Design an enzyme around this catalytic site. Sequence first.
Site, short mmCIF file in Angstrom:
data_model
loop_
_atom_site.label_atom_id
_atom_site.label_comp_id
_atom_site.label_asym_id
_atom_site.label_seq_id
_atom_site.Cartn_x
_atom_site.Cartn_y
_atom_site.Cartn_z
N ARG A 184 77.76 24.70 54.68
CA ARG A 184 78.83 24.04 55.35
C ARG A 184 80.66 24.48 54.93
NH1 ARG A 184 82.21 18.90 52.56
NH2 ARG A 184 84.05 19.18 54.43
N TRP A 214 71.07 12.87 57.68
CA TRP A 214 69.86 13.49 58.98
C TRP A 214 68.81 13.42 58.97
CZ3 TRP A 214 74.55 16.16 57.28
CH2 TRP A 214 75.57 15.98 58.30
N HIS A 234 83.43 25.72 57.69
CA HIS A 234 84.39 25.25 57.25
C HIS A 234 86.10 26.84 56.63
CE1 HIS A 234 84.46 20.80 57.06
NE2 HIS A 234 83.67 21.25 57.40
C1 HEM Z 1 81.44 19.01 65.39
C2 HEM Z 1 81.44 19.57 64.09
C3 HEM Z 1 80.91 19.19 62.89
C4 HEM Z 1 81.63 17.60 63.12
C5 HEM Z 1 82.43 16.71 63.27
C6 HEM Z 1 81.04 17.96 61.34
C7 HEM Z 1 80.87 17.12 60.55
C8 HEM Z 1 80.38 17.02 59.39
C9 HEM Z 1 80.61 15.83 58.23
C10 HEM Z 1 81.62 14.82 58.27
C11 HEM Z 1 79.76 16.41 57.52
C12 HEM Z 1 79.52 15.23 56.00
C13 HEM Z 1 80.23 15.55 54.93
C14 HEM Z 1 80.39 14.67 53.01
O1 HEM Z 1 80.82 14.54 53.53
O2 HEM Z 1 79.95 15.88 52.18
C15 HEM Z 1 79.74 17.24 57.08
C16 HEM Z 1 78.47 18.29 56.53
C17 HEM Z 1 77.35 19.12 56.45
N1 HEM Z 1 77.44 19.73 58.12
FE1 HEM Z 1 78.90 19.49 59.27
N2 HEM Z 1 79.87 18.73 61.18
C18 HEM Z 1 80.23 19.84 62.34
C19 HEM Z 1 79.49 21.02 62.88
C20 HEM Z 1 78.63 21.63 61.35
C21 HEM Z 1 78.43 22.67 61.72
C22 HEM Z 1 78.98 23.93 62.87
C23 HEM Z 1 77.98 23.18 60.50
C24 HEM Z 1 76.99 23.99 60.52
C25 HEM Z 1 76.41 25.96 61.79
C26 HEM Z 1 77.96 22.34 59.84
C27 HEM Z 1 77.27 22.24 58.57
C28 HEM Z 1 76.84 20.92 57.63
C29 HEM Z 1 76.59 21.15 56.79
C30 HEM Z 1 74.94 21.57 56.00
C31 HEM Z 1 76.57 19.95 56.07
C32 HEM Z 1 76.05 19.51 54.83
C33 HEM Z 1 76.55 19.63 53.38
C34 HEM Z 1 76.46 18.64 52.19
O3 HEM Z 1 75.34 18.48 52.47
O4 HEM Z 1 76.86 18.34 51.40
N3 HEM Z 1 78.51 21.58 60.18
N4 HEM Z 1 79.82 17.19 58.45
#
Ligand code: HEM
Length: 291
Positions: free
Chosen positions: A45, A188, A49
């Site tokens: 993540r 998820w 970002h």
């Molecule tokens: C429209 C695109 C995306 C949206 C709206 C989105 C949104 C989010 C949100 C809301 C979280 C949770 C944050 C939290 O409460 O800790 C999250 C977590 C995460 N995202 Fe996405 N995401 C997007 C794209 C991506 C992409 C492209 C990647 C990586 C190639 C990614 C990788 C991750 C990972 C690995 C987490 C887990 C983090 C954790 O466990 O703390 N995301 N994302």
Amino acid sequence: LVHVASVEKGRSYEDFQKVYNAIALKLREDDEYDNYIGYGPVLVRLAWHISGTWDKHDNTGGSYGGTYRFKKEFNDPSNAGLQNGFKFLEPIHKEFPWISSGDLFSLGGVTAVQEMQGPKIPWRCGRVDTPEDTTPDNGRLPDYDKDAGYVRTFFQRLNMNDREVVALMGAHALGKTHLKNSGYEGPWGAANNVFTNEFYLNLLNEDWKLEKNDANNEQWDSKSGYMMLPTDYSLIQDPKYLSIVKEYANDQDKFFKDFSKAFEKLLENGITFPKDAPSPFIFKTLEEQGL
Ligand code: HEM
């Protein structure tokens, strides 16, 4: 803006392989974080970002400048919770003081995916730390509560086509949402610190129900205890996205090959590599080295 990659002076393959081995050995060691998920998910993540701020129109943002180190980008609402990935990588940066921030932030993302049994991701060195006034304004990273038309349009700024957006979103097999960081709560899937095509199989096979959570936001909840964001559920509502979701649900190797190409493209956007620059490095995992 032009951003030309410059290799950290005098470093070769073997120096970067040691920084990789250090991040990977500390992933093994701090396995208790976030109820035994480990730091692997918040590190991919973090890599997405610092890279997702890029704007193809004026070449500002993206991974080159390592600008997340500055307070403005660091206190962006959209980045709540990333301070844990930063705190993890900081002992490693005191140990290898020569590596630039953008190279450390993006290599952490690469190490996490390959140590969680993901595909090999080719990686290139060469980012340079740029000044606090090159630090992008907040509001370039995507909203959570939107549909597939917003998703396509947002990723056009980083010029990702449909196949690359769907391959990239498969990273949501990892980790979970956290109410205090984003206003959404839940994982998820079940194997959330192993890299598989699970996100696609759940999106297609679960019986999703729309409901409000304790923050007053909407999300898709399933009987199994899993969730999906409005932006994730968008991928089976759009006819173009849905055919690619099905493709990855039936073939994990095809997903690994496409994720690999799209993730390196994401981490390299806005960076010019001179033809004298080294080829991309393929790092060995701990296990392949016997460590
Ligand atoms: C429209 C695109 C995306 C949206 C709206 C989105 C949104 C989010 C949100 C809301 C979280 C949770 C944050 C939290 O409460 O800790 C999250 C977590 C995460 N995202 Fe996405 N995401 C997007 C794209 C991506 C992409 C492209 C990647 C990586 C190639 C990614 C990788 C991750 C990972 C690995 C987490 C887990 C983090 C954790 O466990 O703390 N995301 N994302």
